[PDB]
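Holo prediction — zinc ion.
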Amino acid sequence: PFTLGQRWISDTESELGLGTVVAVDARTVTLLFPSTGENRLYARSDSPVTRVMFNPGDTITSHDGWQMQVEEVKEENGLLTYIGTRLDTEESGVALREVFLDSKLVFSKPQDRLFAGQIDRMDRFALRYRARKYSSEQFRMPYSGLRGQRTSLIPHQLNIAHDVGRRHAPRVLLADEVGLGKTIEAGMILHQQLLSGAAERVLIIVPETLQHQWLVEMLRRFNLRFALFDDERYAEAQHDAYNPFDTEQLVICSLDFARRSKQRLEHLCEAEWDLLVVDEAHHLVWSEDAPSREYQAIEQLAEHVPGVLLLTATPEQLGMESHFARLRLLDPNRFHDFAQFVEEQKNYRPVADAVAMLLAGNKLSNDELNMLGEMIGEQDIEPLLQAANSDSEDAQSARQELVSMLMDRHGTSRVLFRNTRNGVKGFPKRELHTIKLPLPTQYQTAIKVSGIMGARKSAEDRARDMLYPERIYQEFEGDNATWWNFDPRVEWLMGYLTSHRSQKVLVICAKAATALQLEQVLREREGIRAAVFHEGMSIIERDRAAAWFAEEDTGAQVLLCSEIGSEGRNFQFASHMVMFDLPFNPDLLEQRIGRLDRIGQAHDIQIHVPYLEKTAQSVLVRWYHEGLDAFEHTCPTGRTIYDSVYNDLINYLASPDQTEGFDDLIKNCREQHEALKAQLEQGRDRLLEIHSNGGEKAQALAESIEEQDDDTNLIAFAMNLFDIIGINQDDRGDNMIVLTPSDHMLVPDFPGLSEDGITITFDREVALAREDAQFITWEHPLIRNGLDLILSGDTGSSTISLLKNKALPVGTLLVELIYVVEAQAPKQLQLNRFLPPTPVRMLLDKNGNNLAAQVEFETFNRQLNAVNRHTGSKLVNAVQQDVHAILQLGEAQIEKSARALIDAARNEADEKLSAELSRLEALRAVNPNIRDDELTAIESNRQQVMESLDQAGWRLDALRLIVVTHQ
Amino acid sequence: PEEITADIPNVGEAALSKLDESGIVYIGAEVTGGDILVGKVTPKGETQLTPEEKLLRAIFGEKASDVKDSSLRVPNGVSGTVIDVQVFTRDGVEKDKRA
Amino acid sequence: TEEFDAIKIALASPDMIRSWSFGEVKKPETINYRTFKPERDGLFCARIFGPVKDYECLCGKYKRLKHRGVICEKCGVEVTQTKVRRERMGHIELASPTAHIWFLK
Ligand SMILES: [Zn+2]
């Protein structure tokens, strides 16, 4: 019935507004859209377009801005002319040609969409309602921001993230021990600050050699795309804008890059960063009489950015005094004089000692205890002070109250976190296995020849060559000589693997060439599946090899090549490792053993060291095992003794025949070990470590997350969501889904999706084993994206359904009404903790009686069925006059339910916000590091929350009509 | 031109295990239905990747030229031993390893 | 599926044949042999018979299913499912009226 001049809207992109018929041919019709002025031509058949007509009682607006009230409309030759009373002038009998209607006819509360022609589906209405329910419940979940990160659930990490991510403008120095996960806690804190809306602009400054590492870590672990800014990018952004740094929210850059020009550093300091993060800040040397030009640029940055995180190391066994140069940067007024800090650390040293005696299980003389009593400046200290020391029944709880009070009285522990490998439980024990092999005669002959031919060469290089026999047999027996046939180590390796076929074994060698030769020999003489992991490979190929190695029982049994390691997520399923060779320096030895020796392993570690009899290997095994205890224990004595013994030991390497003098070197090594151990145990700040590990509340949080991580409703909602959106989901089978778009996807391009597809896993352990997959949680960008896509659009907001129930009258009306309570506030305030968009379901009858409390949603939805487009279309209009009368029925109950929800939310707000503000005030009353700005921020945030909550409103989001038939 | 390289998109390393670096099965290998007889890559054009996307590709190593595989597979339900291989090159700049 | 009966056969009038046809095929060319997209006016033409691939126009301006009646401004091909390319017939306007061999020989 298309006729030139009619108004039509698109059922889907109504954001275009009204259109106007301006041409018609045999197959097509053309709509002009005055909102933009464009024309769109559609095929007459299947007609996915909607007639826009109005009925008596509607108020409409004309192109001149005035509005009116329609009372009667004539139609002739397909065109409508509206007749009614112009309301702004009170003129009756006013005519408005439909061509002159405005475009600002937006998707009214769906009791208006009944007359839009084809209406949405009923499974998208189901997804719409389920989505609002799940999103509402999950936004208020207590531990938001702590499940989507691709990490192990390590207690101290979760504790640090929980504590720091909730602070305002956090300024902290992370001096965690090397290898514990400093950057992991940093990334978690970043994930919280970005997810909570507290921050939008972030700047991370990293040495260039680590820039790519950061790029991948934030991308693969935290789903965060940073824009790298180099000189080229800086120039192309200088052309596009006055300030180049306004084009991206998240920026990585180098500190050397930051110092290039002065206008560069000022533009950087003016980019209004919310957070700044600088790793390895110990490289910033500062002298009281001469601070470097390097430190000055960070000091300039940290003054223009509220929150600033510094990651660092505390090496060479020195104290936090070396840290003053950086403490001065965190709180320059609180920490402003070195000497006072020196006095503080010296006068606290006895206190630290006395604490170590307390917690070690010793009695503390009154003379000792009346110095801690001097520290805690109170007067009812005595009874609790003595109960802890007499070893009464509650001596444990009195010790715990003492330590708790100590942490609250420590001068720095709130701003400094040092977790040690001694203050953390979970590491597996390590047992050693040594195997003495006969040196084959081919090597004796090959090395004595190198000895003769080795006339003019340093003993250092004599020891570097004789270390690895494989690489001297390639100079005298010719390159590529088949040395893999007589070396007994190879036979031992094969025999052990073929005898332990049901065990995954990690085999470490020095260089990739030897690894390729090992793969070739294991394949061509025993068919052993082994993936190589060397520096020459790309990230995707090595990831592929890790994937193969992760196959439970059908993949590679063995692995591995040169150093590389660095794989954050570890092989927690692997518990047996063999050292095909031994490194030179003890740091490489401890890092190699470190790659597996991590918290979260399956079982204890079995280390197998096959070494040739009477060679440098035989020397080094003796040095490492009896002397340093470096295999079974991890104490970092190696470097000091190695430097103190280097020139002597060289001779013991270049000539393993001379055995005398060795055993005294070994006793010297054990003496050095004992001295270093003693000094380190006597340097432990056990109070700082107790404040660092979070304790029982942190373990409780970690187990609450371990129990929240089995949500199967999440997977069941996900499948529905994607499938409805039109995302093909190929089930590979081994807990991995491959998502690929489809011809029927619902959006031009989906932000995260690509045509090549992405693999996902819902199990945290699989994610920790397969870093090539996306770890899907409630906080994953894919889900949040789809959520915004549905809850912002209007699909799933209106449908009709029939019910066949003999026990009800024909033509009865049940009306599902989904109101949404919302507040309008900037996301920076984080109102969503207290009032996200909240659904309010109501199942009205003809009398306005609610049945939802009696009739659950799922059960009711199951037994319902849809109609066909056409008959249903006017079947809706059959009750157009009825639904209007249905609305006032709910009008009286919506105000009661709303006022109940608002009242409850405002109550929860004032209690929790006053309890937290009181806690922070108590801290200011108990700790000197809490700033005025902090308390002001919380007070203003509480006031703003009560204010924005006092103006919250409701709106009709969804509406489903139900009509019972028996036909 | 299509390529014979062993770098084949979205194939598990199981399938590559039996292929040499040149992309030809090892003489004497036991095969089964569905295994990849030889590796071939179909060229892809007009990728038009964004410059940041190009940088990401560079670090990751993803190849715009590939993304499609024309690799021959063993016919369904036939399984035997590869006894012989022959290579016929019309133009080739130099004789291939296998050649 | 409807419940039908009585399949009827009769002479096709020229106006009915014009009714079935969606477009004129002017040139005998089919495809460019270089880019395998079909000819603008050829035995194989997207604007007459249908889109090659489901719900996406020839030039590639409109590809989503959200659009079901739009006809791309650049390529006059409407975005629908390629199955229609199985039912759309074309027509040729002959300059000289030609005899139907069946009714003659
Ligand atoms: Zn087009």
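READOUT: The domain at 149-423+685-711 of chain A is CATH 3.40.50.10810 (Rossmann fold).
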